[PDB]
Design an enzyme around this catalytic site. Structure first.
Site, mmCIF file in Angstrom:
data_model
loop_
_atom_site.group_PDB
_atom_site.id
_atom_site.type_symbol
_atom_site.label_atom_id
_atom_site.label_comp_id
_atom_site.label_asym_id
_atom_site.label_seq_id
_atom_site.Cartn_x
_atom_site.Cartn_y
_atom_site.Cartn_z
ATOM 1 C CG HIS A 157 34.540 41.836 41.060
ATOM 2 N ND1 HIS A 157 33.891 40.688 40.636
ATOM 3 C CD2 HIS A 157 33.845 42.887 40.533
ATOM 4 C CE1 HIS A 157 32.895 41.021 39.843
ATOM 5 N NE2 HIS A 157 32.838 42.342 39.767
ATOM 6 C CD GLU A 160 35.886 38.644 43.108
ATOM 7 O OE1 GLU A 160 36.376 38.305 42.038
ATOM 8 O OE2 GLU A 160 34.762 39.130 43.188
ATOM 9 N NE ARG A 215 30.263 42.791 42.422
ATOM 10 C CZ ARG A 215 30.311 41.515 42.003
ATOM 11 N NH1 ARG A 215 30.924 40.641 42.802
ATOM 12 N NH2 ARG A 215 29.766 41.093 40.842
ATOM 13 C CG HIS A 284 35.538 37.030 38.735
ATOM 14 N ND1 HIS A 284 35.061 38.259 39.123
ATOM 15 C CD2 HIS A 284 35.639 37.060 37.384
ATOM 16 C CE1 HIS A 284 34.923 39.028 38.052
ATOM 17 N NE2 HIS A 284 35.235 38.311 36.981
ATOM 18 C CD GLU A 358 32.976 33.612 40.388
ATOM 19 O OE1 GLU A 358 33.826 34.089 41.168
ATOM 20 O OE2 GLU A 358 31.841 34.111 40.231
HETATM 21 C C1 O2S Z 1 30.872 34.977 35.560
HETATM 22 C C2 O2S Z 1 30.415 36.042 36.574
HETATM 23 C C3 O2S Z 1 29.035 36.562 36.135
HETATM 24 C C4 O2S Z 1 30.581 35.554 37.995
HETATM 25 C C5 O2S Z 1 30.394 36.393 39.253
HETATM 26 C C6 O2S Z 1 29.885 37.784 39.036
HETATM 27 O O1 O2S Z 1 30.526 38.692 38.437
HETATM 28 O O2 O2S Z 1 28.791 37.934 39.580
HETATM 29 C C7 O2S Z 1 31.698 36.429 40.096
HETATM 30 C C8 O2S Z 1 31.631 35.259 41.105
HETATM 31 S S1 O2S Z 1 31.999 37.856 41.131
HETATM 32 ZN ZN ZN Z 2 34.506 38.745 40.990
#
Ligand code: O2S
Ligand code: ZN
Ligand code: O2S
Ligand code: ZN
Ligand code: ZN
Lengths: 396, 392
Positions: A157, A160, A215, A284, A358
């Site tokens: 993404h 980030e 994103r 992420h 994360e």
């Molecule tokens: C493990 C994933 C599903 C976590 C989350 C996402 O992709 O929504 C991130 C915080 S962007």
């Molecule tokens: Zn992410």
């Protein structure tokens, strides 16, 4: 260049499904131009949303009218960006690891690192993006061919930014410590490491050139004005609408079918062609979590006990440096249900040590984390990565 | 010279009053030679204790056999120490220094900045060492002032190291950074870097874990008084110990400790101190009065909003999370502590900081975290000083 003066980031608490559905009503109103940082999920998952100035009163009065509690995490998004731009304005030893870089600056860094460490580091191209940019992976290896390997990716993404910035730091760290720190040397003398620092180059370029809040990928979707697919809903495992969106305008739009995004298919083809990836870690921000499968369903992975114990050791290692608190668990238990996310697919291919991180923070800055936190984030996260890598090495 | 090979630091959890009492019972046991980092307080307040190599078995067995749950915070205290063990421009701010090195620094900084910085001796320690405060001033005489102290507890070495960094920072920013120059153009800053020099020299020479002063206690084998239990506010009430061997021994009378009496004299003789900030480690807390009683200060709402702003500012830099509140709410009841006294003297902006970390390292913070601690703390200090300047 998009600006965000007077935009606010609200954290909305939703105490029951009724309140979740009311916030989904807001999400459905495209004219509000809302930008969800953490989308509606289940009750008790906070919903973080950037709201443009002209939408602020309407949103606040709505939530108040429905008795839905919220707090304002960020009062003026542009103040954070102006700051970010402000502190932004040779060899890898003189590279500034404590600031955010552009795509060109990162790719220049890759070539410098290869030039300086030709016996350890090479650069691989695993595809070209939708817009034609090369996609590059750094391979750290002391020999063999197709040795068992650890895969790490950051920046799938684009917004980030602390994750690409940590990836750059990890690449330098590996070259510093190989041949110097024996415990790390022992990892690379047996395993290869692949590191994909800019996993979505088009979105990254777009976060610098156009919209810091971007994103998704930058693929065009036939007969929609909305661009891009969430690459973390585009994997072929659990793909679907329970945890992603079929709406092209959504931040979690999964595309028409799995692997529709070349940035995802490039990694899939790499992994399958390599065939001997033993750990796959996708990074992420934000929320401070370390997670193992599954995102799409509540059934535990057959290796849950082992992965949970390893997660606990890894967050304890992370916390050793600054005390930063990460929770851990399956994706579905620790954050929310999500359809078609990376490690559901990698685990299904047989990569037992499939994890997703994360990083910082827990919403005060979100993905607009101050550059001054890059190195601390990277250092603590590296300790968690070392834990996973030692386990991959010694406890296959 | 103490070594701590095989010493552990335990974090003991106490669910109710009856359990607190059971832990408080082995606080009584001289033969165990325990060293409480965070002593028995109320229930739900973690007890942190360094337990020596020969005593580990013994205390582990005691706790389990009474059902007190605990966790092992630090496995080998020595490992954190072996890890540890020209001009102010070339002074190494990222390492821990000795007393003489810091006193030499004081003279170097004064020599380099003779119109801004001066050294004042406010007394001598129990062992005869001079006690020095740096005055930063752009003129006047007894202008309104901010007082900052570090190192009142000798083992809290990140505080003295941060105090050295703040001294240099003031000289770098004055005349360059307008917001900070605005502070010193109206207020003086007094900075006491080594508030407990005897205890500091002792952490270097004999015992890294020393907390108290080094005064001899009439009719006891035990040495030292807790200088942060010796102030005349709630003196000797719940929240300190009357046992001379205790980490929190309050001494025989308030201000018995010359290191504390010298500050009290200074403050009363000065009469224009508007903010007083006393810095400790560890715990990541920013607190205002009171520690000795539950009654809130008349200025509680203002102080609490100021604390929120200061901890927000601090956290921006490296992400470090501080909690804040009155001492009694945010940590525990404590009697005879500095800011209860200073606030009772009308010093409205009376704050005490606990810096990094929240127990992994405790006061054995790695030298690589000195500068980040000092930088982020300085943002919170600026918040308090701006407020002192602009909203008296
Ligand atoms: C493990 C994933 C599903 C976590 C989350 C996402 O992709 O929504 C991130 C915080 S962007
Ligand atoms: Zn992410
Ligand atoms: C505000 C007071 C009670 C501070 C505390 C102490 O003196 O025990 C430090 C953390 S050592
Ligand atoms: Zn202290
Ligand atoms: Zn103001």
């Amino acid at each position: 260049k998009e600006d965000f003066v007077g935009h606010q980031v609200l954290r909305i608490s939703v105490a029951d499904e009724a309140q979740v559905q009311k916030v989904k009503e807001l999400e459905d109103l495209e004219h509000l131009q809302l930008d969800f940082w953490r989308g509606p999920a289940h009750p008790g998952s906070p919903i973080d949303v950037r709201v443009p100035f002209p939408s602020i009163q309407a949103v606040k009065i709505f939530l108040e009218s429905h008795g839905i509690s919220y707090e304002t995490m960020i009062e003026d998004v542009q103040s954070l960006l102006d700051e970010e731009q402000e502190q932004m304005f040779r060899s890898t030893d003189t590279f500034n690891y404590a600031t955010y870089h552009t795509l060109e600056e990162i790719y220049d860094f890759l070539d410098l690192l290869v030039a300086e460490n030709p016996h350890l580091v090479s650069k691989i191209q695993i595809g070209n993006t939708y817009e034609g940019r090369p996609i590059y992976v750094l391979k750290f290896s002391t020999g063999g061919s197709k040795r068992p390997a650890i895969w790490i990716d950051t920046g799938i993404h684009s917004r980030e930014w602390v994750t690409q910035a940590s990836g750059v730091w990890f690449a330098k760290k590996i070259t510093q410590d190989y041949g110097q720190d024996a415990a790390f040397t022992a990892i690379l003398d047996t395993l290869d490491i692949f590191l994909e620092i800019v996993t979505n180059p088009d979105g990254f370029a777009f976060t610098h050139s156009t919209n810091r809040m971007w994103r998704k990928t930058r693929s065009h979707t036939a007969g929609s004005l909305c661009i891009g697919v969430d690459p973390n809903r585009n994997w072929d495992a659990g793909f679907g609408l329970s945890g992603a969106s079929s709406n092209p305008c959504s931040e979690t739009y999964h595309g028409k079918f799995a692997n529709s995004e070349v940035e995802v298919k490039s990694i899939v083809d790499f992994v399958k062609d390599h065939g001997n990836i033993k750990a796959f870690i996708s990074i992420h921000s934000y929320s401070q979590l370390l997670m193992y499968p599954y995102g799409y369903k509540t059934e535990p992975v057959p290796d849950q006990d082992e992965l949970d114990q390893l997660s606990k050791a890894a967050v304890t290692a992370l916390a050793s440096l600054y005390g930063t608190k990460f929770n851990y668990g399956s994706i579905i238990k620790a954050i929310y249900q999500a359809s078609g996310s990376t490690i559901d697919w990698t685990y299904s291919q047989g990569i037992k040590y499939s994890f997703t991180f994360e990083l910082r923070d827990t919403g005060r800055y979100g993905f607009l984390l101050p550059a001054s936190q890059i190195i601390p984030t990277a250092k603590e996260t590296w300790l968690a990565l070392l834990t996973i890598m030692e386990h991959t090495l010694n406890h296959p």
